Amino acid sequence: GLVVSFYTPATDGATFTAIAQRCNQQFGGRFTIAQVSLPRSPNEQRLQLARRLTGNDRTLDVMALDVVWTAEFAEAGWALPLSDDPAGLAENDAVADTLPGPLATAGWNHKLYAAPVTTNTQLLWYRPDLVNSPPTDWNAMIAEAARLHAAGEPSWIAVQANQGEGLVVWFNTLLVSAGGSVLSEDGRHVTLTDTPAHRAATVSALQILKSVATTPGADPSITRTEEGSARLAFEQGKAALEVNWPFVFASMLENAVKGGVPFLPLNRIPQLAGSINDIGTFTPSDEQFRIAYDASQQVFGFAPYPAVAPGQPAKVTIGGLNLAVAKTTRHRAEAFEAVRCLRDQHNQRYVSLEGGLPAVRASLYSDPQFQAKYPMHAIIRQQLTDAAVRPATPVYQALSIRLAAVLSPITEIDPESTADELAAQAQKAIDGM
Ligand SMILES: O[C@@H]1[C@@H](O)[C@@H](O[C@H]2O[C@H](CF)[C@@H](O)[C@@H](O)[C@@H]2O)O[C@H](CF)[C@H]1O
């Protein structure tokens, strides 16, 4: 029958292709979901969708949106409200058995405009064979990197952050962890420097960025304009401390079994031969998972994101993907039916355990069979419960571009003057209404 197109980030395309294929067996031949890839970069993801939306591409049906695009797509009319489902089932489905943090990212002006499908929060990943106890706060991270450099050990702090959205995410986490905020609750005022407490938070965050950027043994890549991968730096043994989203867990086991991780030669364990399937994905039996995870524990550990204020946890910026029905769709009923099928319990287990993307269904985090394959589950749920959020505003794309340009390169941050420049650039973004 008809085709429901399903646009997703390219890096997640294989995972969502698998989910769509499962969802296509359950539709009685009434319709088919066809996954289509978008570039890497949240901003260029959005750009491609916005061109199709303003050009009235009537073949565009369902979109996997970064959590920061809700306000823009809702206010533009590009994402239909879930109440536009002709069956009237979308809103109840979106909230049922779903964590509240993700749901907050899917709303605008008191209505839902998307159904959460994946969420995200960053953890500390470390080498337990080199780092005796994982740092609990950022001054401790700095000290550990220095101690490693002095011992001749890998000294990079690999943070998934170059000159774009990941850098804005890191800054947002530090800022909110210190008690600040980019914008006011209603999104209409810049609150980086408007009170002494807010200015103090912004300065504290900038001081941490600058300190990490200039630790002895820091990555020479910080200053340049090119793109590096924290995940790959750690897998290659260039860093013993990494701050990243939890997809690095699935990556570490898979690439180790393939032979791509020098300090974790799972490719030399006979019991793991053939645990890569014929499309290249690590798909272990229960016993193979136990063998690979036990081996990995010697060289790979995880821990909460480091705090800014010692003594209590960080407030970690939430990430993820929400499923929205485009206003261009010719088939609203089937597009909303597809959204419900894409986020069902079976496909949520799959998106976390094979795709590396945290599920949004609360039940999974209370499910011992899921917990046995997703060992980070408790820290992830804790960090999603008291999460920082990036500002929700229709001009987010312009705000993030202006913020990232001030922050980058982080070696050139000077906390007091950079704080004022940030506030002035943020103000230009929201002055564009
Ligand atoms: O498509 C990928 C995605 O771009 C990127 O997304 C994550 O970082 C972004 C940049 F900070 C956040 O804006 C986003 O919210 C958050 O999920 O890494 C994911 C895997 F962790 C991928 O699935």
Curated annotation (Swiss-Prot):
Disruption phenotype: Mutants show no growth on trehalose as the sole carbon and energy source, but grow normally on glucose. They secrete substantial amounts of trehalose during growth on glycerol.
The protein, known as: Trehalose-binding lipoprotein LpqY
Subunit structure: Monomer. The complex is composed of two ATP-binding proteins (SugC), two transmembrane proteins (SugA and SugB) and a solute-binding protein (LpqY).
Subcellular location: Cell inner membrane
Biological role: Part of the ABC transporter complex LpqY-SugA-SugB-SugC, which is highly specific for uptake of trehalose. Involved in the recycling of extracellular trehalose released from trehalose-containing molecules synthesized by M.tuberculosis. Trehalose uptake is essential for virulence. No binding affinity for maltose.
Organism: Mycobacterium tuberculosis (strain ATCC 25618 / H37Rv)
InterPro entries membership: SBP
One Gene Ontology term from the biological process aspect of the record: biological process involved in interaction with host
